[PDB]
Amino acid sequence: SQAFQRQLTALIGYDVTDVSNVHDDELEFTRRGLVTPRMAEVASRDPKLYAMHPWVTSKPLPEYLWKKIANNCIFIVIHRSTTSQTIKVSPDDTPGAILQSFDFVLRVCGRDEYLVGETPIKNFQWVRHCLKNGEEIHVVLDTPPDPALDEVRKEDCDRKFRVKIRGIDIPVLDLTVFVEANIQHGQQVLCQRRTSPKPFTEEVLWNVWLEFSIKIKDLPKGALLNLQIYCGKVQLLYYVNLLLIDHRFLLRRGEYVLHMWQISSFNADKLTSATNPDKENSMSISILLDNIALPKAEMPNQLRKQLEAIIATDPLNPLTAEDKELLWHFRYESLKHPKAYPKLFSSVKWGQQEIVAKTYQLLARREVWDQSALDVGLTMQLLDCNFSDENVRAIAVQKLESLEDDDVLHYLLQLVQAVKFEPYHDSALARFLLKRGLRNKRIGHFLFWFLRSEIAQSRHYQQRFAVILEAYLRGCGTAMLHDFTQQVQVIEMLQKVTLDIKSLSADVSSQVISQLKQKLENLQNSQLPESFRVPYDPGLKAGALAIEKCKVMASKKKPLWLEFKCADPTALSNETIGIIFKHGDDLRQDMLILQILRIMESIWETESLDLCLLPYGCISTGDKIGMIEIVKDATTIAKIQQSTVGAFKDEVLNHWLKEKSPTEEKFQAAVERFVYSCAGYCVATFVLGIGDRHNDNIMITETGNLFHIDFGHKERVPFVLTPDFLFVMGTSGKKTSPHFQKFQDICVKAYLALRHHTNLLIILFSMMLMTGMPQLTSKEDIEYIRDALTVGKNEEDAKKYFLDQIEVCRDKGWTVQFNWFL
Numbered sequence: 106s107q108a109f110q111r112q113l114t115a116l117i118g119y120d121v122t123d124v125s126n127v128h129d130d131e132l133e134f135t136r137r138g139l140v141t142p143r144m145a146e147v148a149s150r151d152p153k154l155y156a157m158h159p160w161v162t163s164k165p166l167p168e169y170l171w172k173k174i175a176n177n178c179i180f181i182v183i184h185r186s187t188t189s190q191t192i193k194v195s196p197d198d199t200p201g202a203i204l205q206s207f208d209f210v211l212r213v214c215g216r217d218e219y220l221v222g223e224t225p226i227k228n229f230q231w232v233r234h235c236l237k238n239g240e241e242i243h244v245v246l247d248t249p250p251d252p253a254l255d256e257v258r259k260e261d262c263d264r265k266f267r268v269k270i271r272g273i274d275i276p277v278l279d280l281t282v283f284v285e286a287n288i289q290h291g292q293q294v295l296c297q298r299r300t301s302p303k304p305f306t307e308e309v310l311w312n313v314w315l316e317f318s319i320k321i322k323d324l325p326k327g328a329l330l331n332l333q334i335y336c337g338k339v340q341l342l343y344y345v346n347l348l349l350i351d352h353r354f355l356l357r358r359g360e361y362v363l364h365m366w367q368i369s370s371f372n373a374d375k376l377t378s379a380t381n382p383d384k385e386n387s388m389s390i391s392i393l394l395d396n397i398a399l400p401k402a403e404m405p406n407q408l409r410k411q412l413e414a415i416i417a418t419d420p421l422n423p424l425t426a427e428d429k430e431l432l433w434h435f436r437y438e439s440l441k442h443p444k445a446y447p448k449l450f451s452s453v454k455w456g457q458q459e460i461v462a463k464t465y466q467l468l469a470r471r472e473v474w475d476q477s478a479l480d481v482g483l484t485m486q487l488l489d490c491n492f493s494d495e496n497v498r499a500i501a502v503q504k505l506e507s508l509e510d511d512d513v514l515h516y517l518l519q520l521v522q523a524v525k526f527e528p529y530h531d532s533a534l535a536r537f538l539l540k541r542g543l544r545n546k547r548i549g550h551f552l553f554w555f556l557r558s559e560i561a562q563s564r565h566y567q568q569r570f571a572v573i574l575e576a577y578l579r580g581c582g583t584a585m586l587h588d589f590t591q592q593v594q595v596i597e598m599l600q601k602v603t604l605d606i607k608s609l610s611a612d613v614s615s616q617v618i619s620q621l622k623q624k625l626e627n628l629q630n631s632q633l634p635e636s637f638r639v640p641y642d643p644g645l646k647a648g649a650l651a652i653e654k655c656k657v658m659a660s661k662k663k664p665l666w667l668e669f670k671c672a673d674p675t676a677l678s679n680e681t682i683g684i685i686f687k688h689g690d691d692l693r694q695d696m697l698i699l700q701i702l703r704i705m706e707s708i709w710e711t712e713s714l715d716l717c718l719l720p721y722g723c724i725s726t727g728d729k730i731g732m733i734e735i736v737k738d739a740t741t742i743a744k745i746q747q748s749t750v751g752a753f754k755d756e757v758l759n760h761w762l763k764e765k766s767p768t769e770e771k772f773q774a775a776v777e778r779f780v781y782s783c784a785g786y787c788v789a790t791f792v793l794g795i796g797d798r799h800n801d802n803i804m805i806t807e808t809g810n811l812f813h814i815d816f817g818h819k820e821r822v823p824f825v826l827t828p829d830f831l832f833v834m835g836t837s838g839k840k841t842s843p844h845f846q847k848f849q850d851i852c853v854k855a856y857l858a859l860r861h862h863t864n865l866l867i868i869l870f871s872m873m874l875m876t877g878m879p880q881l882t883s884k885e886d887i888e889y890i891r892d893a894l895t896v897g898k899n900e901e902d903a904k905k906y907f908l909d910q911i912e913v914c915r916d917k918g919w920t921v922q923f924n925w926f927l
């Protein structure tokens with residue numbers, strides 16, 4: 106009976122049933138609360154397409170991918186057993202229309218990926234992938250996997266709000282101290298009251314009633330009592346929060362001893378209803394609440410222009426009261442424009458019941474919103490920290506419902522992160538992630554990993570995500586639970602081997618080279634499963650290790666270059682699968698940046714641009730420790746310079762390139778691929794403000810493809826465009842080329858393409874910093890991307906700013922590159 110529950114906890118890495126850290130039943134309520142939407146999407150999903158999870162897009166095939174077709178004919182090699190004859194097909198041919206060549210089903214060779222269902226083959230991703238890298242398709246006639254295998258193991262006062270601060274206690278502690286109690290909505294403070302400062306001892310009692318000005322009825326659902334502890338010109342030392350209105354719409358009464366979080370700023374961690382579970386080392390405030398529920402267009406020219414100017418500004422542009430007052434007065438005009446929504450609701454006086462009352466009548470008449478073409482940027486904006494109203498938030502999630510599954514993957518990581526801004530554990534977002542995850546094994550797979558990532562290294566949100574993940578797991582299907590169990594075990598095995606090996610070092614001295622391979626062989630025998638799914642690439646099953654190819658690195662974090670046999674024999678390759686396990690750095694950042702990169706690709710796709718970024722798979726699996734996809738046939742720019750020498754010579758790259766190209770035909774492809782690659786990463790890193798990088802952190806493949814790595818990480822350069830890069834482009838110091846302008850051609854197109862989604866990138870960056878960079882979440886750090894994207898400026902002016910940047914690199918050659926040495 107209850108072994109299943111233990112099974113689930115082992116998958117999550119957290120005990121959902123435990124109640125050592127609550128003070129109410131929200132977590133347990135949300136467990137119950139989620140059952141229905143679990144059951145619903147379970148029920149309504151077609152078990153056959155769920156088994157095959159046909160990864161397909163409904164976008165156009167871009168102008169770069171058309172040009173690479175053999176005139177409305179594509180070839181698909183079908184494999185019998187030891188013989189494989191090919192077939193002629195046209196893009197619009199459904200799998201059924203090809204399958205007929207004279208029940209059974211198609212499958213890609215090596216991967217657990219299927220070309221089935223009612224879409225042409227040009228809509229399946231695998232096909233688009235083969236076309237892109239310049240590859241030939243390879244299917245295999247196979248029996249459809251049994252749905253049986255997926256089956257789920259089925260079953261009002263007018264009083265001013267007063268809070269009494271009794272006191273704070275801390276088990277181990279040098280000036281005075283006060284407690285700051287803020288009523289809060291969004292990041293907005295509605296009302297604030299401090300205590301008088303007492304001397305700071307291991308226990309400080311006050312017994313004060315902090316009476317607030319705001320009334321009880323005027324409290325809005327989502328309001329947070331934010332209690333904060335400062336000591337003095339002060340500093341914040343501890344924070345903690347308490348929802349003033351609970352999950353049943355009930356006002357919060359009674360005695361609350363709350364354990365608090367420390368510090369080392371718009372960190373998402375500061376918003377949490379989670380109390381610290383570490384009761385021994387942690388500060389704790391003590392309070393008493395005593396109170397009942399709450400219930401459920403013809404303007405001047407000049408103004409409308411002022412209004413339209415406002416709707417038209419970027420999400421990070423601050424609204425003045427003047428601005429806010431205007432948006433609110435002209436509610437109904439502003440409602441006509443979907444792009445006003447963030448700003449409009451950011452102009453609502455939330456600590457005022459009649460206004461919120463009005464705000465809802467406004468929401469009830471959202472005919473224009475409910476019809477508008479889905480905009481992820483605009484949608485995202487309404488799920489950030491600036492919005493705490495369920496009905497506001499729920500209209501954002503309404504618009505997400507309409508995303509096809511392909512687009513869900515593009516945004517899942519950040520949609521998962523955005524759960525950190527929800528006031529309550531049960532939410533339209535959380536549930537939308539749940540169902541969309543249960544409807545699609547691919548979404549479901551990464552959801553698991555994305556939740557487990559955060560559960561494993563966030564105390565502030567593990568309790569919530571734990572619950573969400575449990576609800577996923579209880580419906581994902583026994584096959585996947587078996588799949589997950591495998592994956593957890595394998596990376597739990599390897600993470601030990603990664604940590605134990607790190608301790609025996611100080612470069613890889615003799616005996617340590619074996620000690621690794623010792624355990625890799627020892628922990629291969631009767632323990633390591635014979636086959637597991639690649640967490641960053643859930644097509645690829647991997648089994649047998651390549652013990653002869655596994656390594657460790659000289660650099661001080663001692664990662665594990667591992668290599669694997671693909672367990673699937675029908676794979677027509679013999680390139681191993683390459684994984685790196687790394688400890689020390691937080692790969693949550695790397696995930697985010699990489700995901701953003703993928704979003705820039707997809708943007709560029711919408712404007713028929715390809716910049717052949719290489720955004721490799723990388724998953725945070727636990728605390729300070731995760732895995733990374735290994736891109737085959739790739740070296741750093743550093744070693745290309747180390748192999749020659751010291752400092753740096755210009756020729757070496759192209760030398761390295763032509764020497765790694767066989768034919769001249771395949772060579773120039775590289776110089777081209779390199780010009781495209783270099784363009785993207787220069788554009789991309791500038792926008793994200795991560796362009797100033799030492800060249801051992803930039804890489805290139807033996808087919809010309811540049812790409813940055815390690816995003817965990819004296820005057821500056823906008824981005825890495827060093828002479829050796831320019832050398833491949835046929836230029837020197839103060840010259841130009843047939844390619845270099847094409848580079849500048851692509852760059853300025855790329856940068857302006859990224860600008861045609863300013864608002865979107867802005868909000869993602871802003872969300873990224875908040876939810877995944879606990880170091881740089883200051884207004885100013887976030888504001889970088891406005892400048893970097895030259896908000897407000899016209900196209901032509903933005904180019905002559907970007908091109909300036911290129912000619913700040915030209916002006917510096919190796920200045921900063923050398924400077925990192927020390």
Ligand SMILES: Cc1c(-c2ccccn2)nc2cc(F)ccc2c1N1CC2(CCOCC2)c2ncc(N3CCOCC3)cc21
Nearest residue numbers: 656657658664665666687721734735736740741744814815
């Ligand atoms: C670069 C490099 C190199 C390397 C390869 C050839 C020439 C110069 N350096 N060798 C390694 C050997 C190991 F055993 C472990 C790590 C590396 C390594 N690192 C270190 C690091 C992990 C730890 O933090 C520092 C950065 C890292 N991150 C990403 C990737 N890649 C490359 C292949 O495609 C996947 C992404 C490699 C890689």
